[PDB]
Design an enzyme around this catalytic site. Sequence first.
Site, PDB file in Angstrom:
ATOM      1  N   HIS A  31      14.516 -11.406  13.374  1.00  4.30           N
ATOM      2  CA  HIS A  31      13.845 -12.657  13.704  1.00  4.30           C
ATOM      3  C   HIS A  31      12.345 -12.503  13.479  1.00  4.30           C
ATOM      4  O   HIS A  31      11.722 -11.654  14.105  1.00  4.30           O
ATOM      5  CB  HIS A  31      14.117 -13.053  15.152  1.00  4.30           C
ATOM      6  CG  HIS A  31      15.569 -13.175  15.479  1.00  4.30           C
ATOM      7  ND1 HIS A  31      16.404 -12.084  15.586  1.00  4.30           N
ATOM      8  CD2 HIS A  31      16.336 -14.265  15.717  1.00  4.30           C
ATOM      9  CE1 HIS A  31      17.628 -12.499  15.869  1.00  4.30           C
ATOM     10  NE2 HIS A  31      17.612 -13.817  15.957  1.00  4.30           N
ATOM     11  N   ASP A  87      15.220 -14.935  10.910  1.00  2.00           N
ATOM     12  CA  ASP A  87      15.753 -16.180  11.452  1.00  2.00           C
ATOM     13  C   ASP A  87      14.809 -16.887  12.417  1.00  2.00           C
ATOM     14  O   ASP A  87      13.992 -16.239  13.090  1.00  2.00           O
ATOM     15  CB  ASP A  87      17.058 -15.901  12.215  1.00  2.00           C
ATOM     16  CG  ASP A  87      18.237 -15.572  11.314  1.00  2.00           C
ATOM     17  OD1 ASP A  87      18.043 -15.145  10.148  1.00  2.00           O
ATOM     18  OD2 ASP A  87      19.377 -15.741  11.804  1.00  2.00           O
ATOM     19  N   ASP A  88      14.973 -18.211  12.504  1.00  2.00           N
ATOM     20  CA  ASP A  88      14.229 -19.123  13.402  1.00  2.00           C
ATOM     21  C   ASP A  88      12.746 -19.309  13.044  1.00  2.00           C
ATOM     22  O   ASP A  88      12.025 -19.994  13.759  1.00  2.00           O
ATOM     23  CB  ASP A  88      14.318 -18.679  14.875  1.00  2.00           C
ATOM     24  CG  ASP A  88      15.706 -18.168  15.277  1.00  2.00           C
ATOM     25  OD1 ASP A  88      16.756 -18.807  15.010  1.00  2.00           O
ATOM     26  OD2 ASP A  88      15.736 -17.097  15.905  1.00  2.00           O
ATOM     27  N   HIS A 109      18.581 -22.737   8.894  1.00  2.00           N
ATOM     28  CA  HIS A 109      19.045 -22.249  10.191  1.00  2.00           C
ATOM     29  C   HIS A 109      19.021 -23.410  11.201  1.00  2.00           C
ATOM     30  O   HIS A 109      18.890 -23.199  12.410  1.00  2.00           O
ATOM     31  CB  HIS A 109      18.192 -21.061  10.662  1.00  2.00           C
ATOM     32  CG  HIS A 109      18.782 -20.272  11.806  1.00  2.00           C
ATOM     33  ND1 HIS A 109      20.035 -19.695  11.760  1.00  2.00           N
ATOM     34  CD2 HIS A 109      18.266 -19.940  13.018  1.00  2.00           C
ATOM     35  CE1 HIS A 109      20.268 -19.058  12.896  1.00  2.00           C
ATOM     36  NE2 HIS A 109      19.211 -19.195  13.677  1.00  2.00           N
ATOM     37  N   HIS A 145      19.070 -25.896  16.592  1.00  2.00           N
ATOM     38  CA  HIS A 145      19.530 -24.580  17.094  1.00  2.00           C
ATOM     39  C   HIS A 145      20.318 -24.732  18.407  1.00  2.00           C
ATOM     40  O   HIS A 145      20.305 -23.846  19.252  1.00  2.00           O
ATOM     41  CB  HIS A 145      18.352 -23.611  17.305  1.00  2.00           C
ATOM     42  CG  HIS A 145      18.717 -22.158  17.212  1.00  2.00           C
ATOM     43  ND1 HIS A 145      19.453 -21.503  18.182  1.00  2.00           N
ATOM     44  CD2 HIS A 145      18.441 -21.227  16.262  1.00  2.00           C
ATOM     45  CE1 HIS A 145      19.617 -20.237  17.831  1.00  2.00           C
ATOM     46  NE2 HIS A 145      19.013 -20.043  16.669  1.00  2.00           N
TER      47      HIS A 145
HETATM   48  N1  LIG Z   1      20.853 -15.035  22.516  1.00  2.00           N
HETATM   49  C1  LIG Z   1      21.244 -16.157  21.736  1.00  2.00           C
HETATM   50  C2  LIG Z   1      21.497 -15.689  20.315  1.00  2.00           C
HETATM   51  C3  LIG Z   1      20.306 -16.039  19.421  1.00  2.00           C
HETATM   52  C4  LIG Z   1      20.344 -15.134  18.180  1.00  2.00           C
HETATM   53  C5  LIG Z   1      21.417 -15.610  17.203  1.00  2.00           C
HETATM   54  N2  LIG Z   1      22.080 -14.468  16.716  1.00  2.00           N
HETATM   55  C6  LIG Z   1      20.728 -16.369  16.068  1.00  2.00           C
HETATM   56  O1  LIG Z   1      21.008 -17.517  15.779  1.00  2.00           O
HETATM   57  N3  LIG Z   1      19.670 -15.714  15.349  1.00  2.00           N
HETATM   58  O2  LIG Z   1      19.021 -16.390  14.355  1.00  2.00           O
HETATM   59 ZN   LIG Z   2      18.821 -18.233  15.554  1.00  2.00          ZN
END
Ligand SMILES: NCCCC[C@H](N)C(=O)NO
Ligand SMILES: [Zn+2]
Lengths: 206, 206, 206, 206
Positions: free
Chosen positions: B163, B9-10, B59, B63
């Site tokens: 991530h 993710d991200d 995603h 965010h």
């Molecule tokens: N500490 C904030 C949560 C961020 C992680 C969340 N589970 C997410 O979106 N991951 O992709």
């Molecule tokens: Zn995220």
Amino acid sequence: RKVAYLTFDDGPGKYTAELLNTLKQHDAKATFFLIGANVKEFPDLVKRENAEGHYVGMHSMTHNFAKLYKNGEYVNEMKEDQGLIANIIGKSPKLTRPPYGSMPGLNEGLRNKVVEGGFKVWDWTIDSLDWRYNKMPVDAAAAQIAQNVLTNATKPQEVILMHDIHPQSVAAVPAILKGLKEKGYEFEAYHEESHFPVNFWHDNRM
Amino acid sequence: RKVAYLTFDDGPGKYTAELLNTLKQHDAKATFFLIGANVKEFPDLVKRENAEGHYVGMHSMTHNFAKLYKNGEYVNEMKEDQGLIANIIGKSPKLTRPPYGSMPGLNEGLRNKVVEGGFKVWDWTIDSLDWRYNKMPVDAAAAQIAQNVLTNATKPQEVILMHDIHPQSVAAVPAILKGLKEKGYEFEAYHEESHFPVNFWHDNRM
Amino acid sequence: RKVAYLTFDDGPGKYTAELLNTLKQHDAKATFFLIGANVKEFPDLVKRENAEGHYVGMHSMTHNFAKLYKNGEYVNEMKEDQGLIANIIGKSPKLTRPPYGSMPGLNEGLRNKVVEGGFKVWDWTIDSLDWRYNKMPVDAAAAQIAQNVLTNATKPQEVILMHDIHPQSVAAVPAILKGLKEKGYEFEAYHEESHFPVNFWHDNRM
Amino acid sequence: RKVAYLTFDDGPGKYTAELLNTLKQHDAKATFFLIGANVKEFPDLVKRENAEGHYVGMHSMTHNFAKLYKNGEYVNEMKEDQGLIANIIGKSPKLTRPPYGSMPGLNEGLRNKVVEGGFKVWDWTIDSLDWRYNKMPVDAAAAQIAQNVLTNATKPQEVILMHDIHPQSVAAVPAILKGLKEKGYEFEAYHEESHFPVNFWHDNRM
Ligand SMILES: NCCCC[C@H](N)C(=O)NO
Ligand SMILES: [Zn+2]
Ligand SMILES: NCCCC[C@H](N)C(=O)NO
Ligand SMILES: NCCCC[C@H](N)C(=O)NO
Ligand SMILES: NCCCC[C@H](N)C(=O)NO
Ligand SMILES: [Zn+2]
Ligand SMILES: [Zn+2]
Ligand SMILES: [Zn+2]
């Protein structure tokens, strides 16, 4: 000995009486975690569940994630639900089943309040996954749910997660009930005097 | 019958290539949920993910919890993101992974809009918690992250949240691959045609 | 001769009594740095810490960075905290442990005033990071926190930073106590007459 | 075989020439991590260190924790320091030594910038603890410092942390030079083409 704890959430509902019949007919005792609103509208089913030897626990008032955990209302809702149930069965149950499980929602602070309020917390060891087959043909769905629980039943104790507000769930139970029985399991209700920990946090105060 | 779904993710980001390489060496497929700004900064990384047999889903753009859920930009942002990704790999992906998970951000209204849009929503069954391990040696962070994952894989399907934008996460991936493979898991990517619901709302429309 | 100084910050708290027992059970002495609000509300726990051979030091009143360091209230808050503790245990401790560590907060002006007030300052040489592990099973968390500490114990003296106000922390202590003793460490409390410097500023006046 | 990398920080200073003599006459090579202001004020010493075959690295401009790490000025300061040193010794050194170590100060973002700016980062494997004995009788202080490193010297490669801006440290050096020499250690300076990772993060890009 092998003991199987069927648990049913979000009730009572319109398939609960059929479930209570199906259970009784196999002399099988179970546990129900009830929502306050469903306790209000189905007082009879509540009274019957206790009357036929099943455990009657709490599953909160709102089943709302943000209210329960983020705004810290969990123990408060479990207590109000407890009152409603106690008004019907004349006992104040201590066992709660967290909406959406305790992880990660039940933080260390809320876990103290549960401990300080006198409550226990049970999660589950098997997810029937019954919600996947919703609004689908009941028998096909139920058979799959059955196989979901049976193939994951391996341990001396198992706490199975089901939902009696779903037809495919209640339909799944007969095949589960004696398929598990041949694997050597017996179907008990939760007893408060025999409490042992079953929670995602492995928090043994609950 | 066991299938692990590594999700990252991200991304994309500066460690993604090293991770894409690790995945390749092990012939392991996986799934990437990308932020729009990183789609635009590392457009060739996106290409390569999809080119090596991984799923590419969205995603969001911002965010930003407030914008996504309180203001209900979610479906918009996932659409905009989708468009960026399409322009690079051809496909208009359908699967989205909500920032901060769906619970409690994706209310029923947004969930209706999601399914109305043709979109899909995945959360996860395992949280590696990888991103929190950022104030210790990277190799030791990776070992505890791998352990988290390896000791929660039990269900026949597991969706593993990670991530690809932290070094200790990508460094954990080798241990994780070997461990789960010992447990009988296969590392497939998400397939559109072969969708099954995985979300905290238990909403099987998405 | 190897010595391990377990230090526990932000207490006393609700797991402190159980920590005091586990300590007592392994014949082990430790150090406690307390916040003013908790000394007031758990006075018995304070007396017991001292009564059972532990050092009882200060950790301020507010645990607020801006008030302590930007507005220069550090020495005032440590003095007020000192007063509270002495009304309970009948000696005025000199050792303080800075909230958020001394770096960069305790600038030379405040360090001078600390020196002019008769106070000592301890930071730490090992960060257990125990408080960060609040989102996993408590036993799993404790095991990793144990590992953090055990793998970083290399020098004849080690000052380990922990927090007795978290469940996963007190649970880690048995494994720490057994690993370090196995690595040859002894578990002493801080003694004022035997003071030696341990601060990020390398200021040996503290 | 065994190699010892004596490193001296925060210089040059007024005992640096006395140390450079003590080193030369023991046919011994070392590494100096210099502060920009001290490079400005002691160009001769800077020139001499390189001229006599020791490595000359950076230790920043401000030695200010908040500027370096919290405001992210680390790489900028190492580059500005690098310029100053290059103007004297005619090459631009790559090795930096983090004030206060890299842990936790050198976060993942900054570790990227260091990697992208072409810099390496060295911490140490032995802390001589020389700062403790400040403003104390030089002779006693130096003997203790000497043994401090000697009792902690066990591994084939060792990076000792010292400070040539302190009299008790420099006085300790002769005795260190003979303990290590007997254990089979050789005293080489760091050279860039033979770089190997020595950093608290175990980030092997540095
Ligand atoms: N500490 C904030 C949560 C961020 C992680 C969340 N589970 C997410 O979106 N991951 O992709
Ligand atoms: Zn995220
Ligand atoms: N239809 C399921 C919705 C909620 C599922 C969740 N596991 C729960 O709270 N069960 O009681
Ligand atoms: N940023 C978290 C603060 C907790 C750690 C800090 N060193 C402290 O105050 N211990 O008592
Ligand atoms: N006299 C010690 C001050 C700084 C010590 C610290 N270990 C460092 O930055 N050395 O270079
Ligand atoms: Zn429920
Ligand atoms: Zn604190
Ligand atoms: Zn320094």
